[PDB]
Amino acid sequence: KIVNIGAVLSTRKHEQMFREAVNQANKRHGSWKIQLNATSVTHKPNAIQMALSVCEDLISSQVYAILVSHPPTPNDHFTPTPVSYTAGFYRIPVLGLTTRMSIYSDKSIHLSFLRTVPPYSHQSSVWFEMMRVYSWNHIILLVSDDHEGRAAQKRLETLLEERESKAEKVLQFDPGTKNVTALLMEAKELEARVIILSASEDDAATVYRAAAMLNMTGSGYVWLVGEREISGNALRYAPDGILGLQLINGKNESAHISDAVGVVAQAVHELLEKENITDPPRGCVGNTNIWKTGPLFKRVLMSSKYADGVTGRVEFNEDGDRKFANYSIMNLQNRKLVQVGIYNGTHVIPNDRKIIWPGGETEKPRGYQMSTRLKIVTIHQEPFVYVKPTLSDGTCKEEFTVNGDPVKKVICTGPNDTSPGSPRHTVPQCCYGFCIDLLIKLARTMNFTYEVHLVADGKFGTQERVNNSNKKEWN
Amino acid sequence: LNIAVMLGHSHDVTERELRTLWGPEQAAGLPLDVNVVALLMNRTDPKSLITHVCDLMSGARIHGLVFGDDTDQEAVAQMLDFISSHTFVPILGIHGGASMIMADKDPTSTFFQFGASIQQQATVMLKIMQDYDWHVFSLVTTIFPGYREFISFVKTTVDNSFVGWDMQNVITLDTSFEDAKTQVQLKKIHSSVILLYCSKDEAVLILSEARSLGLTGYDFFWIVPSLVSGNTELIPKEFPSGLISVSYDDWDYSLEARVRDGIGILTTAASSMLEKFSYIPEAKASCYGQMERPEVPMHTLHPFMVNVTWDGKDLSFTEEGYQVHPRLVVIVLNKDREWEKVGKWENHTLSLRHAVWPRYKSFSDEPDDNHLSIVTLEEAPFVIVEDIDPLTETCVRNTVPCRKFVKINNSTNEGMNVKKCCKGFCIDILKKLSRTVKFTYDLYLVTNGKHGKKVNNVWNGMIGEVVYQRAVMAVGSLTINEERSEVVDFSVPFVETGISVMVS
């Protein structure tokens, strides 16, 4: 009967809040012999230890579930791995209270760890809602190469290819990139100015410097920002009008205490309705067997619904992250966040406070701006492209057709020694043929300019294998 | 200098001390005074981890770690993270739960394990599908954490293949104890070879269901890796013949052989330390304090575990700590349901097998009489025999492999059954009969005689294989003679012939 439920905080007043919520749980819809005794542990000064209270004090008191905060500083590298995985020997479910590190969302290694606060990769889905409100097709993605970052990349690419929307670039980083300027000059090459960001704080702040440095901060350069970069100095070097995110009820953890105790209490009263309730092991000695009701814990927690939470409906994803937690979209304006976006989880509510787009006006910009400059490479095929040399001037001659008509000629940059493993020298060479006539017809009827090159390979190029004997690539 | 060892209760401790003494007197005679502390346990228990680990970290800061248990819990190797990150001491996982690789090795992890390397699992499973030409699949996994990885492996490594593997989709059983939805999803299996990626108890459940589904017939085949086999010492009941696993078991090895191998790996890493440094970053002192930081200023073994060679065997490791030249003991269950040596992968990761195609051999019987021994002559253009083409597989568009008896010498006439590619009229006709009469046809070639010879009426060739029932069926370009119709019955004529005369 007696269910011991743990809590990892830094304080003990909110542990007493857990105790009073346990009293509420004994009062509310859950009754009555004796089924609960109180266990609640603060953070430890030695981050090596982290399991002394767990085995000696919690598992010895048979704790079924622990509710864990970040750290006693909550901002170092002490995001809570060790209590979770030392509970994860025998597949014991743990609810991270306010964690947003989506490393923990990885089910493959983090086995039984579910959250009341969803991480930023779920927020990736939120940006797709921006798509359907603001009609985009050309996308700039910027990812510091993280397991969080690559998992968010997976969610982004799935939700793109489900609606067949196609991003342009995903440039990749480490946490610590400062010579972003090469990748910034690559970023100057697009129709798109839609900037989606996922990195650390100082990464962001230096980028808000270098890109502003490029200039690259004009109207259209819209900064789509994860909330880690809405902290620290990423705040302090960003321009204004930037669309950022806020999860509603992310910090008031007393509401999380009330909601979590109600959820876990009625989850226990769902557990007690089942059969073959295995006994929780006291010792972390001699107990050489994983939980059997571990997956039954999971079937309780995934299938239980809690519409009556303080944060809204406490009902989860297929990640154990809450569905339809309320979202808001904010705008630094004179570096002061301004409410625009509101979501239940999906329902678009733009506030009457207008979006000054983070350069110029409130006009919805376009990541669509053509250049009318068409990079063409031309295959060495006569009569389609007669590839002859130019003059000594580097210029084409004055010749004629059989009809006495002056030939449409193209200076074409291309190699001299057009063979692999040769000194290839990009020389202007005259080009003649069908397609030049076609392109100048399209220049007249279509108003484009054309950037014509020769093939270094002299070939079309097929899918062939690069070394390791599996890399099928178009050549 | 110091190596700690925790084991399952197994071959004993003084035995391991003698193994350490023999490794010390063997080779690479160690300016570092290597000292090893070993124990035998049976626990999956973290207080045992705290006691043993913290008391050995208090004692002289032990620098090496070897773990071969008699366990099966996969998350133990995942719980070695806090040893790899709260001691920063390199870890070796040979047997037990330390063998069970599901921990994708972190930059804070110091893991090197003799366990079942996952990418190499996928490639070796596909080469098993290569080497007996089982192109037709059926794929059944579950949604244990880390199987979507294997789904990605199968999809990419088939799509990176020009072989063109016949794909039946990955049938993921959602949850356990469904028992009606599982049978709906497992009646969707409509091919021969069934590839399972599950647990052990779910494999009990799936075999109990598929013995009712008729999918455990013994022309079907069952290649199920070390996720289900694990301990070959444990042979449960419902697991029939022809179950094929890939595991780093001590059939080809012992405990102490792998002990001496892994200690040698650590000593070549320590010799590369003594090359590139002259000092060693010591292990931590206690589990109960953090004095300055975790600054690894003296650069532990992760560049030093890159290059390891021993005794003609490259015991080096990849970037994710997996074996560059792996062992990969491929083990097939038989009639007696015994875990026996079949395949090896130590020579350039190439297969080393018994050439035994049939392995499902009436364990939980399911008798089937459909195999037609058809042994004919090389008769152009009815039968045209090519050799094995190196076209990234052994699969040519019009061929069947036909096992010749290639004799070794004149004194040793042992006809090695060499599979060779086969085409012609009659093989197209047998394809038509596999499309109309729809059975299986066993193609071989005639060596003794050609058609039939009354050697005191002891028939040779085709008729010798028919009468003595070597070739139960025989097609050939066989002239239906009256003398042959006395001896052998014949079908309809299907090609008109007779005797003609060729001249200029």
Angle at A298 between CA A294 and CA A302, to 5 degrees: 175
B157: chain A residues, CB-CB within 8 Å? 470
Rg (CA), chain B: 29
CA distance A198 to A143: 5
Q: Across the interface, do B82 and A295 touch by the CB < 8 Å criterion?
A: no
A289: chain B residues, CB-CB within 8 Å? 44
B419 neighbors B403 (Cβ within 8 angstroms): yes
For residue B126, which of B153, B99, B90 has the smallest C-alpha distance? B153
Number of Cβ within a 10 Å radius of residue B500: 5
Q: Across the interface, do A108 and B102 touch by the CB < 8 Å criterion?
A: yes
Give the distance from CA B343 to its chain's centroid.
6
Angle at B451 between CA B449 and CA B454, to 5 degrees: 75
Sheet holding A94-96, edge to edge: A36-38, A3-8, A63-68, A94-96, A113-115
For residue B448, which of B482, B486, B415 has the smallest C-alpha distance? B415
- By Cβ distance, the residue of B71, B79, B160 closest to A85 is B79
Q: Across the interface, do B160 and A88 touch by the CB < 8 Å criterion?
A: no
Rounded to the nearest 5 percent, the helix, strand and coil shares of chain B are 25, 20, 55
Sheet holding A306-309, edge to edge: A306-309, A312-316, A322-323
CA distance A282 to A56: 9
B96 neighbors B76 (Cβ within 8 angstroms): yes
Q: Across the interface, do A287 and B45 touch by the CB < 8 Å criterion?
A: yes
Say if B102 is an interface residue toward chain A (CB within 8 Å): yes
Per DSSP bridges, beta strands A427-432 and A409-414 are: antiparallel
- H helices of A291-409, in order, are 294-303
Say if B287 is an interface residue toward chain A (CB within 8 Å): yes
CB neighbour list of residue B81: distance below 8 Å, 6 or more residues apart: A81, A85, B103, B106, B108, B109
* DSSP for residue A416: S
Say if B81 is an interface residue toward chain A (CB within 8 Å): yes
CB neighbour list of residue B462: distance below 8 Å, 6 or more residues apart: B375, B376, B377, B446, B449, B450, B451, B452, B471, B474, B476, B478
CA distance A313 to A321: 12
What's the token pair of residue B486? 């006395």
Beta-bridge mates of residue B445 = B376
B344 neighbors B325 (Cβ within 8 angstroms): no
Q: Across the interface, do B104 and A470 touch by the CB < 8 Å criterion?
A: no
Best mutation site among A76, A284, A299 for testing chain B: the one with the most B CBs within 10 Å? A284
Tell me the binding residues of B: 11, 95, 233, 249, 477, 479, 484
Say if A289 is an interface residue toward chain B (CB within 8 Å): yes
Q: Exposure string (b/e) for B241-275, b if CB count within 10 Å is 16 or more?
A: bbbbbbbbbbeebebbebbbbbbbbbbbbbbbbee
Sheet holding B2-8, edge to edge: B35-41, B2-8, B64-68, B91-95, B111-113
Q: Across the interface, do A284 and B289 touch by the CB < 8 Å criterion?
A: no
Sign of the four-CA dihedral A360, A366, A368, A370:
negative
Kind and range of the H or E run holding A137: none
A274: chain B residues, CB-CB within 8 Å? none
CA distance B99 to B116: 7
For residue B96, which of B119, B77, B120 has the smallest C-alpha distance? B77
Q: Across the interface, do A46 and B288 touch by the CB < 8 Å criterion?
A: yes
CA distance B128 to A276: 42
Say if A285 is an interface residue toward chain B (CB within 8 Å): yes
Q: Read off the amino acid at residue A410.
A: V
- DSSP class per residue in B211-254: HHHTTT-TTSEEE--TTTS--TT---TT--TTEEEEE--TTSS-
Experimental method: cryo-EM
Per DSSP bridges, beta strands A463-466 and A449-454 are: unpaired
A462 neighbors A453 (Cβ within 8 angstroms): no
Sign of the four-CA dihedral A423, A425, A431, A434:
positive
For residue B66, which of B94, B89, B39, B43 has the smallest C-alpha distance? B94
B171 neighbors B188 (Cβ within 8 angstroms): yes
- To one decimal, the resolution in angstroms is 5.5
What's the token pair of residue B20? 């350490």
Angle at A264 between CA A258 and CA A265, to 5 degrees: 85
Per-residue H/E/C for B44-82: CCHHHHHHHHHHHHHCCCCCEEEEECCCCCCHHHHCCHH
The distance in angstroms from the start CA to the end CA of chain B is 89
CA distance B217 to A225: 57
* DSSP for residue B347: B
- DSSP class per residue in A225-261: E-GGGGSTTHHHH--SSEEEEEETTSS-HHHHHHHHH
- By Cβ distance, the residue of A48, A107, A285 closest to B288 is A48
The CA distance from B265 to the nearest CA of chain A, in Å, is 26
